[PDB]
Amino acid sequence: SSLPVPYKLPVSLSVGSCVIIKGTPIHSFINGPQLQVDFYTDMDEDSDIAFHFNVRFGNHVVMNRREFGIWMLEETTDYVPFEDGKQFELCIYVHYNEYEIKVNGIRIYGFVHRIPPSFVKMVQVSRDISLTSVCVCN
Amino acid sequence: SSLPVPYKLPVSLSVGSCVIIKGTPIHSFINGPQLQVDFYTDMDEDSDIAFHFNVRFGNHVVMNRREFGIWMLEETTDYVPFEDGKQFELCIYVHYNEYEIKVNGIRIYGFVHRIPPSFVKMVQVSRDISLTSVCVCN
Ligand SMILES: OC[C@H]1O[C@@H](O[C@H]2[C@H](O)[C@@H](O)[C@H](O)O[C@@H]2CO)[C@H](O)[C@@H](O)[C@H]1O
Ligand SMILES: OC[C@H]1O[C@@H](O[C@H]2[C@H](O)[C@@H](O)[C@H](O)O[C@@H]2CO)[C@H](O)[C@@H](O)[C@H]1O
């Protein structure tokens, strides 16, 4: 891996920001690897989470937020167009109303803001991947 | 312009970070356009500057830092491989000892750190350009 995992990146996000994560699962899909991305409101990992994204590769995605320390109503999709063994590109685009999530150029979900994305101060990329690059673009 | 100018971007920089700025001068070179990039230590524009970069297109580049509110010893180079009228790509790579400055893929300078780049909290892109994108990569 080019970057350490878990990777904690201090960020400032605004409408129009894009978070681009490139990496490779470290296990084949029959071994149940996961990839997790958390949009934290502080560097402290017990702070609130505006957007939590966990992919069980070959299975499904779970998304949520944590508000006042409490996990809210979980959202899911079974659309996980990742390829076994290959590098992926995960793009999270900050729109005025939602985070748009794209996997290898394919839009899979739009997670609507329940707090403004300007409250996000750290992005954590974790679990069973090797990281090639993380970019934040405007 | 896709982004407002002056563009003030809150950033966190570490060794291995790359700041990629894409834009176009808004005047032809005979009209003396400039492009300026400041690596500020705070959002306040009177805070100290770890790295100041000002290109007089078709002319030369001036670089400096501002410490305790005082401009230090100015550095210059006449290597300014920008093209009149065209989009440029300006890459600033944070190495352990220096910022490496590339213009359209060409390394033109290495400005050595006099404070650690982790002290940079805002990047300001200013003067006579239209901005297409600013990316911070690791
Ligand atoms: O919702 C994401 C969030 O939930 C926790 O796991 C849930 C689990 O998804 C649910 O099926 C079960 O009923 O309650 C669990 C709460 O412990 C995770 O622990 C957390 O990491 C998040 O992934
Ligand atoms: O060194 C960059 C810094 O200097 C100021 O301009 C200098 C100028 O470059 C120098 O030739 C003259 O002798 O002193 C000036 C100080 O006022 C700029 O004002 C500042 O914006 C920076 O560009």
Author numbering:
A (entry chain A), B (entry chain A): 2 to 139
Authors' account:
Galectin (Gal) is a lectin that binds to β-galactosides. Because the primary and tertiary structures of Gal-13 are highly conserved among all galectins, it had been named galectin-13. However, our crystallographic and biochemical experiments (solid phase experiment, hemagglutination assay, and biolayer interferometry) proved that wild-type Gal-13 could not bind lactose or a rhamnogalacturonan Ι domain (RG-I-4) from Ginseng Pectin. Primary structure alignment showed that a highly conserved histidine residue was modified to arginine (Arg53) in the ligand binding site of wild-type Gal-13, which may be why Gal-13 could not bind lactose.
All three other variants (R53HH57R, R53HR55NH57R, and R53HR55NR57RD33G) co-crystallized with lactose, but not Tris, even when the crystallization conditions contained 100 mM Tris. This indicates that these three variants prefer to binding lactose. Without this residue, Gal-13 cannot bind lactose. Moreover, in the crystal, Asp33 from one monomer occupies part of the ligand binding site of another Gal-13 monomer. In order to eliminate steric hindrance, this aspartate was mutated to glycine in several variants. However, the pyran surface of the galactose residue in different structures could not be totally merged with each other, and glucose residues showed variable conformations. The conserved tryptophan and histidine residues in the three variants showed the same conformation and position as in Gal-3 and Gal-8N. In Gal-13 variants, His53, Asn55, and Arg57 in Gal-13 variants show similar conformations to the corresponding residue of Gal-3 CRD and Gal-8 N CRD.
